[PDB]
C-alpha cells in the first residue's frame, strides 16, 4: 500500500500545502530544510522560556 511515493506525498501535504504540487526531489528539499528550521526555532523558544521563568520567578509573593 505505502509506496515510496505515498509517503513522499504524505510529506508534501506535510511541509508545504494541502494538494498544491511541487514535484519529488523538491519535497525532499523543503523537508530537510523544514526540519533544520523547526529544530532551531524550537531551541530558541526553549531558551526564551527559560528567561521568562528565571527573570520571572524572582517577581513573586
Amino acid at each position: 500500500r505505502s509506496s515510496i511515493n505515498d509517503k513522499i506525498i504524505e510529506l508534501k501535504d506535510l511541509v508545504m500545502g494541502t494538494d498544491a504540487k511541487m514535484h519529488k526531489s523538491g519535497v525532499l528539499r523543503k523537508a530537510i530544510d523544514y526540519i533544520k528550521y523547526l529544530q532551531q526555532v524550537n531551541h530558541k523558544l526553549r531558551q526564551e522560556n527559560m528567561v521568562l521563568k528565571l527573570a520571572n520567578q524572582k517577581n513573586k509573593l
Partner: protein, 876 residues
C-alpha cells in the same frame, strides 16, 4: 400539492415525480426560507404525522442548516441567524420539544438541535439549550426515546461544534453522558447513544482527565460498558479506550494492569470482527504513542532536560501475549479477497509490522517459532501466515540479525513461489519484495540469485496480484544489483553487474507484462513501467544493446498510442490514455539518458515528432504539456548542440509554456528548459534571446504568477549570461537592477513557507550575479573589460550577502552560492574585494561556516573563496 404529501413524493412509482419536492421545496425555500423551515418545525413537533413526513421534514431543516464542506457549512449558519432574530425564537423550543416524541423517527430532532446550536453558540446565544439537554438525563424521570435521542443531540454537537467554543461547560455535558452510561440504565439503546457521545467529547474533557478524581470514574464506566452484552455498546466502549489511550497515555499507568490489558486482549480474540478490530487497534495506538515518546527521550537526553512524558514500554511488555494472538489471526484469511475490505486478518499483519518497528530486535524471538513451525503446514492458511509473519518483521530488527535468517529462508521462499494457493503466492511475492527492498545484500546474494531470478521472471506471468509485487521486487533488486557492482564500476559506471546475464530477458518480459489485458488490475501496468524504467536507470554499461531494442519498442508504442487517442469513449478511457501517455514519456526520459550521443541522433527526429505532435495536437489538456517539456529537456541535454535544428520547429511551444502562468507547474518546466537550452546551444541562442528575455522579465513583473516560478527566472538570467557572454551587455542594465530589487526583498520570517521562499530568492539572485560576472569575465585568463560594468555593484553585492550572514534562517545552499560569488568577485576585481569583506567580519564567519559545513558544494566553495581571498592578502 401539499406538505405532508410532497415530502413523501420520494417513495412513489414515478421517476419524474421523484423531484415533486426537490423543486417545489427548493424553488420555495429561497423565497421564504424563514417561512419554509419554521413551518417544517411544526410538522416535526407533530406527534400525528408519520415518519416519512416528519423525517423528510427534519431533513429539509437539517440540510438547510448544514453541509459537509468547510465553506458551504460556515455559510448556512449565518443565514440561520441573519434571519429574523425572532423567527428562530420559536424554532428553538418547537424542535427542542420534539425530542422523545416517536419510537425511532423524531431522531432527526437530534440532527437539528445540533446544527442549529452549531451556529447559535459561537455567538453567545440559546442559553436555554445546554441547560435543557443535560437536565433531560440528570432527571431520574425521563423516557428512553427522551434520553436516547437527547444524548444523540449532545453527541451530534461534540462532533461538529468547534471544540474551542465548548471547552467551557463540560461537566454538565460530561455528567449527562456519564449517567447515560451507568450500568443501571435499562435500555442498551440509551447507553449506546451515550457512549458514542462520550467518544465525540473525549477531545474537550482535557480538564477532567487531568484531575485523577473524576478520571477514575470516567475510566471505570468505560471499562464496565465494555462488558455490557450489547455488542453495539461493547464496541463503542472499546472505541473509547482506543481514543483515550491516544490522548491520555500518561494517565494509563493505573488501569492498564488491572483492566485495559485484560479487556483488550479478550477483544483481540473475539470471534466478532467489529470487536477484535478495536482490540488490535488499541495496541497499534500503544505502539504509536510509544514510538513517539521514544523520540522525546532521545531529544530530551541531548537537551539535558527530562522528557515531558515517558514511556512505560507497554508494547514491548505484552509481546509474548500479543504475537501469538496476531499470528493466529493472520490465519483467519479470506480466500475471497480482491476487496477494499478491512478485517482482523489485515489489521493483524499491519499491527505486527508496527510492533516490529517499535520493539525492533526483541520482536524476532517471539515471531520466529510460529514461522518455523507453520511454513511447512499442509493448511494453506498457515503456510500463508508463516510467510506473512516473516515478511512483516523484516523492518525494525537489526539487519545483520535478519540477513542470516533470510539466507536460510531463500530456498523455501523460492519454492513457495510455486505454492498452489494464490494467497500463499501473493503473500510470498510480497515477502520477496520486502526482502529485496529492506535487505538487498541477502537478496542479491550469489548462492540463490540464479534461481531467485528464474522464479521472478516467471512470477511476472502470474496473476496481477502476484506479478505486481514481482515488479516491485525487480525494481528494488535492480537498484541493489547496480549499487553492488559499484566497486566493479570504473570511469563512473559499472562495466557489468549480476543481472546482466538475464537483463535482456528481464526487460523483455517486462515489456510483455506492460502489455496486459488486465494491466489495470493491481496497477500491474504502472508497476511494470516503473519497474522497466528502474531496470533501465540502474543498469550496467554492458547491456546497452538491450536498452536500445527497448527504445525502439518505446517509440513504437508512443506512436500507436498517439493515434489510439481518437477512440476514447468513457471518461474512464480518457484518464487511462493520459496515464499510458505520461508513463511512456517517463520511460522515454529514462531510456534516453542511457543512450549514446550517437543513438540519440538517430532517435532524435522520431522522438521530437511524437513530442512535438503530442504537444501540438494535445493543445487542449494542460497536464500533457508539462510531460512533453520534460521529455525535450532530457533530449536537449543528450543532443546538446545538435538540438539546434528542432529549435525553430519548437519555439512556439516554449512560448506557450513560458506565458501560461495559470499552471505554474508548466511555466516552471519552461523556465528550466530555457536554461537547458542556454547550455546546449549557447551564443547561438541569441536569435530568441530578445523574445525570451522580455517574455521572462514580463513574468517577474506581472504578479498573477506564482512566486515559486519567480526565483527560477532570476536564476535563468545567469544561465543566459553564461551562454551569450559579451552579448548579455545588451540586457546587463535592467537585470542588475532587478537582482538588487529582489535581493533587498523582505518577509515575516514567521511564516516558514516565507523562509523557503526567501532563501530560494536569495539563492536564486546569487546564482544570477555569479552567472553574470562569469559571463562577462569570459574565459581566457585575460579578464575581458566587460566585467568592469558590474564594478559599481560590487559594493552593494558584498552587502546582501551580509544580511544573510547575519540572518540565521539560512540554508547551506545559500552559504554555498555566496561563498562562490565571492570567489568569482575576487577573480574579476579582487582588490576592491579583499577590503570590503575585511570591513565585514560576519562574511568571514559565514565562510568558516561554509567549511564546518557537511554539504559538499558548501565546503569546496568556502575553501576556494578563502584561498582566493588570502591570495589578495599578499598582493600588496
Amino acid at each position: 400539492m401539499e406538505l405532508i404529501t410532497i415530502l413523501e413524493k420520494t417513495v412513489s412509482p414515478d421517476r419524474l415525480e421523484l423531484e415533486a419536492a426537490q423543486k417545489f421545496l427548493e424553488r420555495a425555500a429561497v423565497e421564504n426560507l424563514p417561512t419554509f423551515l419554521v413551518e417544517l418545525s411544526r410538522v416535526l413537533a407533530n406527534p400525528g404525522n408519520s415518519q416519512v413526513a416528519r423525517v423528510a421534514a427534519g431533513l429539509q431543516i437539517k440540510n438547510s442548516l448544514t453541509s459537509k464542506d468547510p465553506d458551504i457549512k460556515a455559510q448556512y449558519q449565518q443565514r440561520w441567524l441573519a434571519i429574523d432574530a425572532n423567527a428562530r425564537r420559536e424554532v428553538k423550543n418547537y424542535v427542542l420539544q420534539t425530542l422523545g416524541t416517536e419510537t425511532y423517527r423524531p431522531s432527526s430532532a437530534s440532527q437539528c438541535v445540533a446544527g442549529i446550536a452549531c451556529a447559535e453558540i459561537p455567538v453567545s446565544q440559546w442559553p436555554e439549550l445546554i441547560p435543557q439537554l443535560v437536565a433531560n438525563v440528570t432527571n431520574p424521570n425521563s423516557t428512553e426515546h427522551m434520553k436516547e435521542s437527547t444524548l444523540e443531540a449532545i453527541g451530534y454537537i461534540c462532533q461538529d461544534i468547534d471544540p474551542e467554543q465548548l471547552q467551557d461547560k463540560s461537566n454538565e455535558i460530561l455528567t449527562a453522558i456519564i449517567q447515560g452510561m451507568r450500568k443501571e440504565e435499562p435500555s442498551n439503546n440509551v447507553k449506546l447513544a451515550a457512549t458514542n457521545a462520550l467518544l465525540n467529547s473525549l477531545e474537550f474533557t482535557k480538564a477532567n482527565f487531568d484531575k485523577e478524581s473524576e478520571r477514575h470514574f470516567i475510566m471505570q464506566v468505560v471499562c464496565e460498558a465494555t462488558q455490557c452484552p450489547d455488542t453495539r455498546v461493547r464496541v463503542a466502549a472499546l472505541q473509547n479506550l482506543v481514543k483515550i489511550m491516544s490522548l491520555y497515555y500518561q494517565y494509563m499507568e493505573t488501569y492498564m494492569g488491572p483492566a485495559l490489558f485484560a479487556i483488550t486482549i479478550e477483544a483481540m480474540k473475539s470471534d466478532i470482527d467489529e470487536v477484535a478490530l478495536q482490540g488490535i487497534e488499541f495496541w497499534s495506538n500503544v505502539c504509536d504513542e510509544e514510538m513517539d515518546l521514544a523520540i522525546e527521550a532521545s531529544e530530551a537526553a541531548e537537551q539535558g532536560r527530562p522528557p515531558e512524558h515517558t514511556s512505560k514500554f507497554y508494547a514491548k511488555g505484552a509481546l509474548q501475549y500479543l504475537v501469538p494472538i496476531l499470528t493466529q489471526t493472520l490465519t483467519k484469511q479470506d480466500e475471497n479477497d480482491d476487496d477494499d475490505d478491512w478485517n482482523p486478518c489485515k489489521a493483524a499483519g499491519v499491527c505486527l509490522m508496527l510492533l516490529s518497528t517499535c520493539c525492533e530486535d526483541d520482536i524476532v524471538p517471539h515471531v520466529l517459532p510460529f514461522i518455523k513451525e507453520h511454513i511447512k503446514n499442509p493448511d494453506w492458511r498457515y503456510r500463508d501466515a508463516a510467510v506473512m509473519a516473516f515478511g512483516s518483521i523484516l523492518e525494525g530488527p537489526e539487519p545483520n540479525q535478519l540477513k542470516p535468517l533470510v539466507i536460510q529462508a531463500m530456498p523455501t521462499l523460492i519454492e513457495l513461489m510455486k505454492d498452489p494457493s494464490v494467497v500463499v503466492r501473493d503473500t510470498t511475492a510480497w515477502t520477496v519484495g520486502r526482502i529485496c527492498e529492506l535487505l538487498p545484500e541477502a537478496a542479491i546474494n550469489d548462492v540463490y540469485l540464479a534461481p531467485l531470478l528464474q522464479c521472478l521472471i516467471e512470477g511476472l506471468s502470474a496473476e496481477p496480484r502476484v506479478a505486481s509485487n514481482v515488479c516491485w521486487a525487480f525494481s528494488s533488486l535492480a537498484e541493489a544489483a547496480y549499487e553492488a557492482a559499484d566497486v566493479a564500476d570504473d570511469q563512473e559506471e559499472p562495466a557489468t553487474y549480476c543481472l546482466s546475464s538475464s537483463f535482456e530477458l528481464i526487460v523483455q518480459k517486462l515489456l510483455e507484462t506492460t502489455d496486459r489485458p488486465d494491466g489495470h488490475q493491481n496497477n500491474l501496468r504502472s508497476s511494470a513501467y516503473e519497474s522497466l524504467m528502474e531496470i533501465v536507470k540502474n543498469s550496467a554499461k554492458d547491456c546497452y544493446p538491450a536498452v536500445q531494442k527497448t527504445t525502439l519498442v518505446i517509440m513504437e508504442r508512443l506512436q500507436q498510442v498517439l493515434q489510439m487517442e481518437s477512440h476514447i469513449q468513457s471518461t474512464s478511457d480518457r484518464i487511462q490514455f493520459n496515464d499510458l501517455q505520461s508513463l511512456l514519456c517517463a520511460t522515454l526520459q529514462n531510456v534516453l539518458r542511457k543512450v549514446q550521443h550517437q543513438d540519440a541522433l538517430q532517435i532524435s527526429d522520431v522522438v521530437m515528432a511524437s513530442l512535438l505532435r503530442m504537444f501540438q495536437s494535445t493543445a487542449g489538456s494542460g497536464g500533457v504539456q508539462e510531460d512533453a517539456l520534460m521529455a525535450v529537456s532530457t533530449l536537449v541535454e543528450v543532443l546538446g548542440g545538435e538540438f539546434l535544428k528542432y529549435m525553430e520547429a519548437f519555439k512556439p511551444f516554449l512560448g506557450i509554456g513560458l506565458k501560461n502562468y495559470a499552471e505554474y507547474q508548466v511555466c516552471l518546466a519552461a523556465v528550466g528548459l530555457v536554461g537547458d537550452l542556454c547550455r546546449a546551444l549557447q551564443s547561438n541562442i541569441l536569435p530568441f534571446c530578445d523574445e525570451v528575455m522580455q517574455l521572462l522579465l514580463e513574468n517577474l513583473g506581472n504578479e498573477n504568477v506564482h512566486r515559486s516560478v519567480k526565483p527560477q527566472i532570476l536564476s535563468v538570467f545567469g544561465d543566459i549570461a553564461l551562454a551569450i557572454g559579451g552579448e548579455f551587455k545588451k540586457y546587463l542594465e535592467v537585470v542588475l537592477n532587478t537582482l538588487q530589487q529582489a535581493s533587498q526583498a523582505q518577509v515575516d520570517k514567521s511564516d516558514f513557507d516565507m523562509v523557503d521562499y526567501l532563501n530560494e530568492l536569495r539563492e536564486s539572485c546569487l546564482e544570477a550575479y555569479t552567472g553574470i560576472v562569469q559571463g562577462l569575465k569570459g574565459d581566457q585568463e585575460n579578464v575581458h573589460p566587460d566585467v568592469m560594468l558590474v564594478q559599481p555593484r560590487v559594493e552593494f553585492i558584498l552587502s546582501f550577502i551580509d544580511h544573510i550572514a547575519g540572518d540565521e534562517d539560512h540554508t547551506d545552499g545559500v552559504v554555498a552560492c555566496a561563498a562562490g560569488l565571492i570567489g568569482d568577485l575576487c577573480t574579476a576585481f579582487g582588490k576592491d574585494v579583499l577590503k570590503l569583506v575585511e570591513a565585514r567580519p560576519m562574511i568571514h564567519e559565514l565562510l568558516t561556516e561554509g567549511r564546518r559545513s557537511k554539504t559538499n558544494k558548501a565546503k569546496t566553495l568556502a575553501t576556494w573563496a578563502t584561498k582566493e581571498l588570502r591570495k589578495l592578502k599578499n598582493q600588496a
